[PDB]
Amino acid sequence: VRPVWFPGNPPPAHLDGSLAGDYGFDPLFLGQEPQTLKWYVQAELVHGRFAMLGAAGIILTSIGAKVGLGFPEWYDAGKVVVEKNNIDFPTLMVIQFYLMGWAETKRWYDFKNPGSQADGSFLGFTEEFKGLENGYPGGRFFDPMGLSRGDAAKYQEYKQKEVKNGRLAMIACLGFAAQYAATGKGPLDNLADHLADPNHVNFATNGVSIPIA
Amino acid sequence: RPLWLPGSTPPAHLKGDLPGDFGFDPLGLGANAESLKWFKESELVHSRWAMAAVAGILVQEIVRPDVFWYNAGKEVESPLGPLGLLAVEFFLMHWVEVRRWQDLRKPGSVDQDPIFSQYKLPPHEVGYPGGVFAPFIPGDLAELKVKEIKNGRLAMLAFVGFVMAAQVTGKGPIAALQEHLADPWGTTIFSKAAVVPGQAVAPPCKIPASVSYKGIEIPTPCFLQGLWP
Amino acid sequence: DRKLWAPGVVAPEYLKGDLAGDYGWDPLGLGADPTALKWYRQSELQHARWAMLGVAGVLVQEIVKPDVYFYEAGLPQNLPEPFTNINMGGLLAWEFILMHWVEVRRWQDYKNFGSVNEDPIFKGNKVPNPEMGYPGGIFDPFGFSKGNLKELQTKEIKNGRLAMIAYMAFILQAQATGKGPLAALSAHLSNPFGNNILKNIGTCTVPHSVDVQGLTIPLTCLWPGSQ
Amino acid sequence: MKDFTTYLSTAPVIATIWFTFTAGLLIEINRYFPDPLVF
């Protein structure tokens, strides 16, 4: 009944449309098992959120680089930041791994044991780490505006918007990597070059995508 | 009942009880009761701060036209040092904000004067202290509340416009109004910039990037200059 | 029954002849959804009225001002006095604000029928609005709606469809010959076997781009003709 | 998927993966630490 990825084909039995952004897309049956599907749902949500942040940051920095603001490209921002400011790269790596390890370990053990991080062993906080659903950690900290604890229909609509935007952002990040590997310039530079002449400045004329061209 | 869109259905959580209720919540931020209670105080405080700020900016330009409000924090010299003024403001603002915050989370708990036991605020609602804070109330309370929230929303948009006009043209509100009134067809934002798929032109940031204040080099960048149209 | 768009064809079930100018023509089935059908009817009415205004404006402009090309009439240097070389930003601002207001009112009328008929400033000033897309009242001060509204609506939609086709004809004629409709008609009347679509096609007289005061606006023809 | 994982859990597949991992670890150790004779 619901729209699927490939029209005419029935959706798989393990995808009944309950999850957000369900289009029956699983030809390899990777998420056929329920626990594996739950783990994959959390993985897809984390991937989409990280890709959304990365895409927004890349677009903003590219916008600042195109106008005379002095911003660097996304493929040179790390070197520019580490060299412009007296910042030690291994120290930053260790700090990020410490913070990410704490947050990810708490999320992991909450996935293994739901609601286990709400006991209060972390500075006395209880309701802020209870977790609403799998991959959707509601509370006053992660959701200070309370958009997940009011107007259930709007919450489901926002869930669909989030998963679709995350998938689009993942595709956008892959496009950024491929565009830099092929053209060698920034994403907005590619967009401007395409807008200047769309019939002759594309992937069919870059000389890398189609080798027989 | 007046609405922000005549003929539309207002949200379920907006029943028209709070002052200034016009059924405007497309994002559904006020669906939660606690969130709405917090946002109501946030809107009231923002409204009052913006009203006082807009009135102060207008009076500042009228009384002192040679002093730019955007530069008011730099070209003002007082016998009291800047760090001393910052400390005084920090302590006084911290005291009043903690009292207001405690009244928000615990209504009817900080209405008593800590110095004099004979002074106490009468029972009221969160965001509307009254008592010594309201010595004169001419007219109805609900009508005046609606007037206050409407004037506050207008003042909030006015302050944002003041900041944007000062960053784009480098002039004050009255100066920008006179400049626009002189050439209305060639002074709007549409006359200053335009974006097309082949070219994107934006107005230059009139505010200097760095400002020297007693040898400290305070950075003063235009708000989101890269995203300017 | 009414005459359909072709002999022997069968009209769709949703096209029973209720709307004016119904010929049972829907090869794509876009009118199957009733809500979509109502929205498409409003869109067709808007396109019809705007196209009629555009065709009448082009013809009257060519008659009154034959030395001004309608294709390049949008340039600020071609504007009449005292609007010549005026700032296009303020002009776009004026049009954007006014058109935004009227179009939001029309859109709200579509979403909620009969909910924005009253004047928001002076109470008591309302429009009857019997059907969607037909406000009346102040929009029809001559009172021509107090009669056979069906045949008049049929005439309106038919004239609008003809004007839509005619306006696109004007656009392609200007893009292939570089002249207005009356000039193209006179040129074809001078030598029908020499000036027609057999030779004028394949050439795009529109330039690559135009510098409107400070910014450049890209231009293109509807077909890949020779620039 | 359950049957596929069970097939991957069989003795030859497990032995192949384990020996590939062990061989890769020894090869990488000898690559980053060439010619180790004594401790």
Automatic annotation (TrEMBL), chain A:
One Gene Ontology term of the molecular function aspect: chlorophyll binding
Positions with a binding annotation for chlorophyll a 18: H194, N202
Binding site for chlorophyll a 12: G138, E162
GO cellular component, one term: chloroplast thylakoid membrane
Residues binding chlorophyll a 10, per UniProt: G138, S148, E162
Residue positions binding chlorophyll a 3: Y23, G24, F25, E44, R167
Name by which UniProt lists this protein: Chlorophyll a-b binding protein, chloroplastic
Automatic annotation (TrEMBL), chain B:
Binding locations of chlorophyll a 12: H94
Residues that, per the record, bind chlorophyll a 14: E97, R100
Record-listed chlorophyll a 22 binding positions: H180
Source organism, top-level taxon: Eukaryota
Binding site for chlorophyll a 9: H46
Residues where chlorophyll a 17 binds: G130, E148
Amino-acid positions noted as binding chlorophyll a 21 in the UniProt annotation, renumbered to this chain: K150, N151
Binding locations of chlorophyll b 1: W4, R48, L121
Record: residues binding chlorophyll a 6: F22, F24, E43
Protein's name in the database: Chlorophyll a-b binding protein, chloroplastic
Organism from which the protein derives: Chlamydomonas reinhardtii (Chlamydomonas smithii)
Lineage: Eukaryota, Viridiplantae, Chlorophyta, core chlorophytes, Chlorophyceae
Gene: LhcI-5
TrEMBL record, chain C:
Amino acids binding chlorophyll a 28: Q173, N196, I197, N200
Positions that bind chlorophyll a 15: H100, R105
Ligand binding (chlorophyll a 1): W5, W25, E44, H47, E156, N159, R161, Q173, H188
Residues at which chlorophyll a 22 binds: G136, E156
UniProt keywords, alphabetically: Chlorophyll, Chloroplast, Chromophore, Photosynthesis, Photosystem I, Photosystem II, Plastid, Thylakoid
Pfam families membership: Chloroa_b-bind
GO MF annotation terms: chlorophyll binding
Record: residues binding chlorophyll a 4: W107, K111
Family to which this protein belongs: Belongs to the light-harvesting chlorophyll a/b-binding (LHC) protein family.
Protein's name according to its UniProt entry: Chlorophyll a-b binding protein, chloroplastic
